[PDB]
C-alpha cells in the first residue's frame, strides 16, 4: 500500500487512464456537457 498522499493518489489514478485511451476518444466520453 503506497506511501503517497491523497491528491497524489488521484494524480496516479488519472495517469493510468491514458494507458489504452487516445486523444481521439477521451474528450467525447469524459464530457461535462483490451490494453
Amino acid at each position: 500500500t503506497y506511501d503517497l498522499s491523497i491528491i497524489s493518489k488521484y494524480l496516479l489514478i488519472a495517469s493510468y487512464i491514458c494507458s489504452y485511451l487516445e486523444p481521439r476518444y477521451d474528450a467525447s466520453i469524459f464530457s461535462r456537457k483490451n490494453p
Binding site: 503506497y2 506511501d3 503517497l4 498522499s5 491523497i6 491528491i7 497524489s8
Partner: protein, 544 residues
C-alpha cells in the same frame, strides 16, 4: 547595458524585540529535536551494521532503508587495524557498468591515501589492499537514489562485486536507500541476484513520519513555547491538518515553516502583541484603547451585558465614558492561561503510556479539543472508555482571546505559501483592472498589451491560425486613437515619418502583435508546433 552578460556581481522597534526573545527560544526546541532523530538514524544503522555473524560468511550484508529520503548521512566506527571507508554513488554518476566501477575505485583510493600517510583504478587494488595499505578493508556503499538507475546496470554491477568474495581480507556491505516500494525493487532485478541478495537482509524502516513520534512531538514543543500568551483557532489548525497531509515525505520541516510564518504574521500587524508581558502596561494609549473596542468577543459580551443587566447605567459607565475603568475591564481578563494547552499535555502523556497508544495525531487531538470532539476522538481505540470522564474537558467560550490568537481568517498564508498559481495568473489576464489604476487617456480607452488578446485567446479554438487571430486582433483596435497616439509626439522625427504613412495603423498592429505573442512563449502559454512552418500553434493553458 550589461544584462546580456551572465552573473556579473556588484558591490553597491519596541514590538520586534519581543518577537526576538520568542523565536530563537522556540528554535532551540526545534533543532534539538532534529538532532534526536539524527542521533536515532545514526544509531540504528551502526549496531545493525555490526554483530551479524552469519555462518556461510561468503555473502555481503545488505540493508534496505525503506521510506528514506535519499539524503540520510552515515558515520562509521573507527575499528582500528582496519580501514572503514564510505563510497556514495549518485544516479548522476551511474552511466554504465564501467564508470560506476571506475569513479568508485577512485573515491576510496584518495580516502585510502589520506589515512595512509601510479596504481590502476579497478579491482586490482582490492586484493592487494593488504599489501598496498597494510590493514584490511570494510567498504560500505551508500546507493543514494536507487530506483532511478537502470537496474540491469545495477544487476551487472553486483555480479562484479561477487567476484571479490575470494580474498577473505575484505568485507562488503551494501546500503540501499530506496525512496519507497520494496515490492517494485524485487520486480526489476534479475532473480538470480535476488537469491544472492536474500542471504542476510534487514528491512529497517527509516521515515520522518513513523507513527507521528516526532510530528506530535514538535507540535507539542510548539505549544509550550507559546503557552498562555496566545491561542490557536479552529480554522487555523485544520489548515495544518489538511495541507500537511498532502506532503508525506517531510512533515517535520514543513510544520516548522508554516508555523513560524504564522507567528511572523502576528508580530507584524497586531498592536496588542506588546501586552503579552504585563510589564508593558505603561505603553497603554488611547489609540490602543480605541482599537480594543472592535474585538468581536468584546462587543458580544456587551450584548451579553445588556440582556443580563437590563440596568445599563453601569455598562454605559464602563464604556468610553470612563477610560481608567475601561482598561481595568480589559485587564481583568488579561492573564487567562487557557488550560486547553495544559489539558492537552495532561492527556498526551496519558494515552502514550497508560493505554500505551501511538497511532494518534496530536494536532487533531488539539482540534477536537477546540470543538468538544475529544469524546469522539478517543472512540477509535475504545480504550479511554474507563477514562473518558477523567480526561474530559468541555472547551469554554473564552473571552478576549481574539486579540491573542492565530487564524487564517484573511486567507493570507493560504495565498502566500500555497498560491493558486495558474489561477492567479489567469485572473490577472482576464480582468487587469484591479492590478492597474497625455497618453494615459488612451489607457482609459484601450487595454494593456498582453491582456487585450487574452479575451479572444479564450475565444479561440484548440489549434489556431496565426493570421486570422491577428485579423480578429485588428478588430479590437479602433483606428482614430492610434493615429492620435502615433501623432502625439512632435519632438521625435524618425517616428513621425512613420506617423504620416497611410498604412501606419496596419503596420503598427503587426509590430504590436509580434511583441505580445513573442512574449507568450517564455510563459509557455502557447507552443509553436512544427517549427519552420509556424502557420498554426497550440494552446495548452486552459482555465482549469
Amino acid at each position: 547595458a550589461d544584462a546580456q552578460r551572465s552573473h556579473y556581481t556588484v558591490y553597491p522597534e519596541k514590538r520586534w524585540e519581543l518577537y526576538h526573545q520568542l523565536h530563537s527560544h522556540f528554535h532551540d526546541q526545534v533543532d534539538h529535536i532534529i538532532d534526536n532523530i539524527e542521533a536515532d538514524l545514526k544509531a540504528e544503522i551502526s549496531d545493525l551494521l555490526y554483530s551479524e555473524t552469519t555462518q556461510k560468511r561468503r555473502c555481503f550484508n545488505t540493508i534496505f532503508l525503506l521510506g528514506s529520503d535519499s539524503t540520510t548521512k552515515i558515520e562509521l566506527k573507527d575499528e582500528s587495524s582496519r580501514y572503514n571507508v564510505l563510497i556514495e554513488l549518485t544516479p548522476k554518476e551511474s552511466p554504465n557498468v564501467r564508470m560506476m566501477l571506475r569513479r568508485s575505485m577512485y573515491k576510496l583510493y584518495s580516502a585510502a591515501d589520506a589515512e595512509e600517510h601510479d596504481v590502476s583504478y579497478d579491482l586490482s587494488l582490492v586484493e592487494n589492499f593488504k599489501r598496498l595499505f597494510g590493514k584490511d578493508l570494510a567498504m560500505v556503499f551508500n546507493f543514494k537514489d536507487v530506483d532511478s538507475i537502470n537496474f540491469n546496470t545495477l544487476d551487472n554491477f553486483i555480479i562484479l562485486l561477487k567476484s571479490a568474495f575470494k580474498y577473505d581480507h575484505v568485507k562488503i556491505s551494501l546500503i540501499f536507500n530506496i525512496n519507497t516500494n520494496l515490492s517494485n525493487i524485487e520486480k526489476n532485478l534479475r532473480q538470480s541476484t535476488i537469491r544472492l541478495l536474500k542471504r542476510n537482509y534487514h528491512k529497517l524502516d527509516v521515515s520522518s513520519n513513523k507513527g507521528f513520534k516526532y510530528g506530535n512531538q514538535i507540535f507539542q514543543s510548539f505549544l509550550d513555547t507559546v503557552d498562555g500568551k496566545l491561542n490557536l483557532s479552529d480554522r487555523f489548525v485544520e489548515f495544518i491538518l489538511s495541507k500537511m497531509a498532502n506532503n508525506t515525505n517531510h512533515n517535520l520541516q514543513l510544520l516548522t515553516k508554516m508555523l513560524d510564518y504564522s507567528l511572523m504574521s502576528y508580530f507584524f500587524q497586531n498592536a496588542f502583541s506588546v501586552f503579552i508581558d504585563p510589564v508593558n502596561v505603561d505603553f497603554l494609549n488611547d489609540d490602543y484603547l480605541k482599537i480594543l473596542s472592535r474585538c468581536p468577543t468584546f462587543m458580544f459580551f456587551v450584548e451579553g451585558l445588556i440582556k443580563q443587566h437590563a440596568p445599563a447605567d453601569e455598562i454605559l459607565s464602563l464604556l468610553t465614558n470612563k477610560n481608567r475603568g475601561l482598561e481595568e475591564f480589559f485587564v481583568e481578563f488579561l492573564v487567562r492561561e487557557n488550560p486547553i494547552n495544559g489539558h492537552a499535555k495532561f492527556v498526551a502523556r496519558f494515552l502514550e503510556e497508560e493505554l500505551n497508544i501511538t497511532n494518534f495525531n496530536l494536532i487533531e487531538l488539539y482540534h477536537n479539543l477546540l470543538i468538544g470532539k475529544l469524546d469522539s476522538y478517543l472512540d477509535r481505540w475504545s480504550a479511554c472508555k474507563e477514562y473518558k470522564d477523567r480526561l474530559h474537558f468541555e472547551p469554554i467560550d473564552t473571552i478576549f482571546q481574539e486579540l491573542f490568537t492565530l487564524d487564517n481568517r484573511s486567507g493570507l498564508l493560504t495565498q502566500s505559501i500555497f498560491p493558486s498559481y495558474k489561477s492567479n495568473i489567469e485572473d490577472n489576464l482576464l480582468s487587469w483592472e484591479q492590478v492597474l489604476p497625455l497618453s494615459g487617456d488612451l489607457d482609459k480607452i484601450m487595454a494593456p498589451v498582453l491582456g487585450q488578446l487574452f479575451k479572444l485567446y479564450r475565444e479561440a479554438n484548440m489549434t489556431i491560425n496565426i493570421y486570422d487571430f491577428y485579423i480578429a486582433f485588428r478588430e479590437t483596435l479602433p483606428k482614430e486613437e492610434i493615429l492620435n497616439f502615433i501623432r502625439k509626439d512632435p519632438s521625435n522625427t524618425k517616428l513621425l515619418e512613420l506617423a504620416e504613412t497611410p498604412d501606419a495603423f496596419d503596420k503598427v498592429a503587426l509590430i504590436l502583435f509580434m511583441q505580445a505573442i513573442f512574449a507568450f512563449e517564455n510563459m509557455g502559454l502557447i507552443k509553436f508546433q512544427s517549427t519552420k512552418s509556424y502557420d498554426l500553434v497550440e494552446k495548452c493553458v486552459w482555465r482549469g
